[PDB]
Amino acid sequence: AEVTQRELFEFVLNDPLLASSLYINIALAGLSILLFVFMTRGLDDPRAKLIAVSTILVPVVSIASYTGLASGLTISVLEMPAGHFAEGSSVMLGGEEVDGVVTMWGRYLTWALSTPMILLALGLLAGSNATKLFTAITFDIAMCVTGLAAALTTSSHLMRWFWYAISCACFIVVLYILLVEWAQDAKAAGTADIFSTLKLLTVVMWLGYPIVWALGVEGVAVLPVGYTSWAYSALDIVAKYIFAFLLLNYLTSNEGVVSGS
Amino acid sequence: VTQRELFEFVLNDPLLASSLYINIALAGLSILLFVFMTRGLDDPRAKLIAVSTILVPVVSIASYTGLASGLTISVLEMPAGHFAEGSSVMLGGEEVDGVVTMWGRYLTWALSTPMILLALGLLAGSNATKLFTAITFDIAMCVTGLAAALTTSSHLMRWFWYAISCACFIVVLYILLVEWAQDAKAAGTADIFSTLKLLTVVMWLGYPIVWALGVEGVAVLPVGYTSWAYSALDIVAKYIFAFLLLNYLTSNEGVVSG
Amino acid sequence: EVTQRELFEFVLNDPLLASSLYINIALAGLSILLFVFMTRGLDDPRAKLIAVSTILVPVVSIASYTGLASGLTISVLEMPAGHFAEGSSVMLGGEEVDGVVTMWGRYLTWALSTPMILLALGLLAGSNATKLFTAITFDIAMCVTGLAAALTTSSHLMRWFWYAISCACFIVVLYILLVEWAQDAKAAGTADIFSTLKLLTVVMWLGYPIVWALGVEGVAVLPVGYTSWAYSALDIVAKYIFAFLLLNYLTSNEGVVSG
Ligand SMILES: CCCCCCCCCO[C@@H]1O[C@H](CO)[C@@H](O)[C@H](O)[C@H]1O
Ligand SMILES: CCCCCCCCCO[C@@H]1O[C@H](CO)[C@@H](O)[C@H](O)[C@H]1O
Ligand SMILES: *C/C=C(C)/C=C/C=C(C)/C=C/C1=C(C)CCCC1(C)C
Ligand SMILES: *C\C=C(C)/C=C/C=C(C)/C=C/C1=C(C)CCCC1(C)C
Ligand SMILES: *C\C=C(C)/C=C/C=C(C)/C=C/C1=C(C)CCCC1(C)C
Ligand SMILES: [Br-]
Ligand SMILES: [Br-]
Ligand SMILES: [Br-]
Ligand SMILES: [Br-]
Ligand SMILES: [Br-]
Ligand SMILES: [Br-]
């Protein structure tokens, strides 16, 4: 590994766009954790608290994920394959010019850890049975891991996009459960309004990621590294922080509705 | 060596490329077929079994792609005394010491078997305790096997990892063939387990036997034959076996429901 | 480009390192035997589930310690400026090498074994699913963020930030085990054994973050050799004896936990 972790860390700092897209989220994730733990202090029902802890875990994983990226621990320099729209790039790391693209794979590694929690909270709010919850979660993880594999794949351009297509198929499974299955389960659960709201927000925001992947450096490359990074951090601010705040706003005011068992 | 160089090593070699790309394609077709076959299930418990099984070829088309792209393939120099020691291969167009190691296979098993196990356990009316015990040791088995494959410091260490792993294997096989076959009687599903009993014992024992005999073990099977031995097993386990389980599940939805 | 073969030889020919690692392999091995023996009497599925979660602990340990012993889970890393271990060197093969022999494999031991002992202590206390889900997730986040700290070499300050995140997660777990579960056990019938262990718990669970901060990963008052025995000493207490005291109570009180 020619490029050191210190060097990548230094490249992030010194790069205004990059460093801000990263450090701003370590900050917002921390404040989110503090606000969430405070908002839910009055919950007592175990099923209501399971929804609150899973929610809270989202920014908890987020602050760790971004610290991994900012430290350089979860960043690597890869060389795109022939034909990849970003093939032939250089990053100027340390003092020399290194071939390749600064790859922030750390985003994928942790999405596989935070998104299931989001899914678990939304399934429970909707009063979902174990089967649909297992189906939503297992495919979500697969969607995130194949995403991480595509980003990590440098041997073949066509391979990169094959991983991507596998990931989309797994994505549609989750989407179908959100829009079709849980939408209906929410009625019987008495949480229709809030679910339909959070459901529409989820579908809209989540669609943003595979769009950014395809337009950013890892895909067709119209967005340079610094910009795809901000595209991902901005989706994160809504998809994770504001979204979790909204779900917890309902829960903390309607404990009785989801209290069941 | 480079990822692309490994990717090209697999393409360009009929034995290797076939042992991998064929698994990618059959896994793809099996996901469709499995989703199709089960389009009619209605019971939640049955459906859990069907999705857990469907995940088998999903994990397979993904993990094999990891291998074919070279992402999960690596080159390792075997320890002194190992029967494959002093091997070399030619990758970046040059003599590279070591053996191409498809460590991605352990990922495939560590992720798909927990799913087939969950499916079988539920089918057998297993309680939580035996389901847990089986899945945990099944995973410890798959991972210690991986450890064995990646160990290059000592020849004896690899075999010690193997012993650790085989131990976890009998724990899993025991509940699979013995415990669950017995629980299935009360669940009204004893027959699917006896019909697939020989198929199950042969394919499962098939993996630790291929290890010992292939490049990772005593090496009477070269890298390419080692790849095809594991691949022919996977084809049986991830596709035909899963199909059989699914074929039964669909005909017995009501009873598996309760 | 140090090899796994050189790391394996480094541990051997290094008395302290070799014994801290090899004594644990041996002790975890017997444990699996002794624990299998002590619990062959069990019949209750709930008592047995608790029994196997606990047996999985020494299994995880003998396997993870073998990873370390084999060199598989060891690496040489260079510490960042200001770090007390920065500027370290180690003899590997036929040349001097910058860095610190990093036993990152230990974090995989804790990440995989602790959720089991937590799933054994929770069920033993009668814990509902919410607490059991909390304690373990934050426990896992703790183990993984600790590794991140150990794996971070770009910034001295970042290591301690990672260590602070890990420590906060650590607080959630200790609050569940010491307080919540302590209460739940009263309605479980198993409040007395939960007490004593809870006491040994505090001391040993705290022992880890204290060692981290004082060993080569922290301010390094303890060299690589001593941090390893420090952790190995703690694992003996938690993975074997603690597991023994737990099983000793279980197998002599299957009626109380039965259900
Ligand atoms: C810029 C300053 C930051 C201000 C943040 C204010 C958010 C506080 C929201 O309060 C919480 O609302 C819940 C109902 O939804 C109540 O149950 C709970 O008791 C109450 O504490
Ligand atoms: C079912 C999904 C599997 C996808 C398999 C993709 C195989 C594509 C092989 O492409 C070729 O690779 C060579 C490298 O060896 C290049 O030199 C050559 O220019 C390129 O055209
Ligand atoms: C906190 C993060 C969130 C909610 C992330 C969501 C991410 C996705 C929905 C990602 C999806 C992708 C695909 C469907 C295709 C391949 C690439 C990915 C991983 C970007
Ligand atoms: C994909 C389907 C199945 C049934 C896979 C089974 C895998 C095993 C039984 C693997 C076993 C191993 C053992 C027992 C010993 C060390 C090496 C292996 C991991 C190959
Ligand atoms: C193997 C058994 C036990 C009980 C292990 C416990 C481990 C911890 C409590 C580890 C804690 C850490 C913290 C809080 C901070 C970062 C570094 C550590 C991972 C060592
Ligand atoms: Br609770
Ligand atoms: Br994340
Ligand atoms: Br269902
Ligand atoms: Br399988
Ligand atoms: Br049992
Ligand atoms: Br433990």
PDB file of N, CA and C and ligand atoms in Angstrom, chain C residues 107 109-110 113-114 142-143 145-147 162-163 166-167 170 204-205 208-209 212 231 235 238-239, ligand 5:
ATOM      1  N   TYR C 107      -9.701  -7.541  18.910  1.00  0.00           N
ATOM      2  CA  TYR C 107     -11.001  -6.887  18.757  1.00  0.00           C
ATOM      3  C   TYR C 107     -12.045  -7.775  18.103  1.00  0.00           C
ATOM      4  N   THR C 109     -12.113 -10.925  18.755  1.00  0.00           N
ATOM      5  CA  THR C 109     -12.411 -11.879  19.823  1.00  0.00           C
ATOM      6  C   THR C 109     -13.553 -11.283  20.628  1.00  0.00           C
ATOM      7  N   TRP C 110     -13.377 -10.023  21.011  1.00  0.00           N
ATOM      8  CA  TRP C 110     -14.376  -9.319  21.801  1.00  0.00           C
ATOM      9  C   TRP C 110     -15.671  -9.079  21.030  1.00  0.00           C
ATOM     10  N   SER C 113     -17.290 -12.768  20.800  1.00  0.00           N
ATOM     11  CA  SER C 113     -17.580 -13.501  22.023  1.00  0.00           C
ATOM     12  C   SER C 113     -18.517 -12.745  22.962  1.00  0.00           C
ATOM     13  N   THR C 114     -18.263 -11.454  23.174  1.00  0.00           N
ATOM     14  CA  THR C 114     -19.102 -10.673  24.089  1.00  0.00           C
ATOM     15  C   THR C 114     -20.611 -10.708  23.788  1.00  0.00           C
ATOM     16  N   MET C 142     -19.103  -0.929  20.159  1.00  0.00           N
ATOM     17  CA  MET C 142     -17.978  -0.657  21.045  1.00  0.00           C
ATOM     18  C   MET C 142     -16.723  -1.402  20.598  1.00  0.00           C
ATOM     19  N   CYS C 143     -16.878  -2.704  20.358  1.00  0.00           N
ATOM     20  CA  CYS C 143     -15.763  -3.553  19.950  1.00  0.00           C
ATOM     21  C   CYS C 143     -15.194  -3.121  18.620  1.00  0.00           C
ATOM     22  N   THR C 145     -15.541  -0.078  17.160  1.00  0.00           N
ATOM     23  CA  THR C 145     -14.958   1.258  17.188  1.00  0.00           C
ATOM     24  C   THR C 145     -13.616   1.232  17.921  1.00  0.00           C
ATOM     25  N   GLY C 146     -13.440   0.257  18.808  1.00  0.00           N
ATOM     26  CA  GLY C 146     -12.175   0.125  19.510  1.00  0.00           C
ATOM     27  C   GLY C 146     -11.127  -0.323  18.499  1.00  0.00           C
ATOM     28  N   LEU C 147     -11.521  -1.248  17.626  1.00  0.00           N
ATOM     29  CA  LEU C 147     -10.632  -1.740  16.581  1.00  0.00           C
ATOM     30  C   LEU C 147     -10.260  -0.563  15.673  1.00  0.00           C
ATOM     31  N   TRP C 162     -12.038   8.005  18.536  1.00  0.00           N
ATOM     32  CA  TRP C 162     -12.574   6.659  18.352  1.00  0.00           C
ATOM     33  C   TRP C 162     -12.738   6.004  19.734  1.00  0.00           C
ATOM     34  N   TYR C 163     -11.728   6.170  20.576  1.00  0.00           N
ATOM     35  CA  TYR C 163     -11.750   5.592  21.912  1.00  0.00           C
ATOM     36  C   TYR C 163     -12.869   6.170  22.770  1.00  0.00           C
ATOM     37  N   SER C 166     -16.224   4.650  21.478  1.00  0.00           N
ATOM     38  CA  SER C 166     -16.261   3.285  21.980  1.00  0.00           C
ATOM     39  C   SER C 166     -16.646   3.284  23.462  1.00  0.00           C
ATOM     40  N   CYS C 167     -16.054   4.202  24.225  1.00  0.00           N
ATOM     41  CA  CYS C 167     -16.339   4.323  25.653  1.00  0.00           C
ATOM     42  C   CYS C 167     -17.804   4.687  25.947  1.00  0.00           C
ATOM     43  N   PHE C 170     -19.786   1.740  25.500  1.00  0.00           N
ATOM     44  CA  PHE C 170     -19.417   0.947  26.668  1.00  0.00           C
ATOM     45  C   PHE C 170     -20.324   1.266  27.859  1.00  0.00           C
ATOM     46  N   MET C 204     -13.746  -6.435  35.742  1.00  0.00           N
ATOM     47  CA  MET C 204     -13.169  -6.949  34.504  1.00  0.00           C
ATOM     48  C   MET C 204     -13.589  -6.169  33.266  1.00  0.00           C
ATOM     49  N   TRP C 205     -14.865  -5.810  33.149  1.00  0.00           N
ATOM     50  CA  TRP C 205     -15.285  -5.039  31.981  1.00  0.00           C
ATOM     51  C   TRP C 205     -14.536  -3.709  31.934  1.00  0.00           C
ATOM     52  N   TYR C 208     -10.638  -3.523  30.545  1.00  0.00           N
ATOM     53  CA  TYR C 208     -10.229  -3.349  29.154  1.00  0.00           C
ATOM     54  C   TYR C 208      -9.935  -1.911  28.722  1.00  0.00           C
ATOM     55  N   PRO C 209     -10.902  -0.994  28.885  1.00  0.00           N
ATOM     56  CA  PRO C 209     -10.590   0.379  28.467  1.00  0.00           C
ATOM     57  C   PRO C 209      -9.430   0.982  29.259  1.00  0.00           C
ATOM     58  N   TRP C 212      -6.270  -0.400  27.565  1.00  0.00           N
ATOM     59  CA  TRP C 212      -6.094   0.234  26.257  1.00  0.00           C
ATOM     60  C   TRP C 212      -5.364   1.561  26.423  1.00  0.00           C
ATOM     61  N   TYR C 231      -4.276  -8.068  28.531  1.00  0.00           N
ATOM     62  CA  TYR C 231      -5.525  -8.466  27.893  1.00  0.00           C
ATOM     63  C   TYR C 231      -5.768  -9.965  28.072  1.00  0.00           C
ATOM     64  N   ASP C 235      -8.923 -11.892  29.698  1.00  0.00           N
ATOM     65  CA  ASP C 235      -9.729 -12.857  28.956  1.00  0.00           C
ATOM     66  C   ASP C 235      -9.892 -14.170  29.713  1.00  0.00           C
ATOM     67  N   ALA C 238     -12.683 -13.489  32.163  1.00  0.00           N
ATOM     68  CA  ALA C 238     -13.979 -13.341  31.510  1.00  0.00           C
ATOM     69  C   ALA C 238     -14.440 -14.486  30.619  1.00  0.00           C
ATOM     70  N   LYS C 239     -13.536 -15.062  29.838  1.00  0.00           N
ATOM     71  CA  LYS C 239     -13.925 -16.148  28.947  1.00  0.00           C
ATOM     72  C   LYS C 239     -13.935 -17.540  29.565  1.00  0.00           C
TER      73      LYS C 239
HETATM   74  C1  LIG D   5     -13.601 -10.930  26.386  1.00  0.00           C
HETATM   75  C2  LIG D   5     -14.485 -10.418  27.430  1.00  0.00           C
HETATM   76  C3  LIG D   5     -14.823  -9.142  27.721  1.00  0.00           C
HETATM   77  C4  LIG D   5     -15.763  -8.967  28.879  1.00  0.00           C
HETATM   78  C5  LIG D   5     -14.332  -8.001  26.920  1.00  0.00           C
HETATM   79  C6  LIG D   5     -14.666  -6.723  27.134  1.00  0.00           C
HETATM   80  C7  LIG D   5     -14.135  -5.671  26.277  1.00  0.00           C
HETATM   81  C8  LIG D   5     -14.368  -4.333  26.448  1.00  0.00           C
HETATM   82  C9  LIG D   5     -15.202  -3.815  27.597  1.00  0.00           C
HETATM   83  C10 LIG D   5     -13.643  -3.447  25.524  1.00  0.00           C
HETATM   84  C11 LIG D   5     -13.692  -2.095  25.576  1.00  0.00           C
HETATM   85  C12 LIG D   5     -12.956  -0.991  24.800  1.00  0.00           C
HETATM   86  C13 LIG D   5     -13.363   0.329  24.991  1.00  0.00           C
HETATM   87  C14 LIG D   5     -14.509   0.814  25.873  1.00  0.00           C
HETATM   88  C15 LIG D   5     -12.670   1.501  24.310  1.00  0.00           C
HETATM   89  C16 LIG D   5     -11.878   1.178  23.078  1.00  0.00           C
HETATM   90  C17 LIG D   5     -11.083  -0.005  23.193  1.00  0.00           C
HETATM   91  C18 LIG D   5     -11.751  -1.283  23.802  1.00  0.00           C
HETATM   92  C19 LIG D   5     -12.218  -2.104  22.590  1.00  0.00           C
HETATM   93  C20 LIG D   5     -10.573  -2.010  24.457  1.00  0.00           C
END
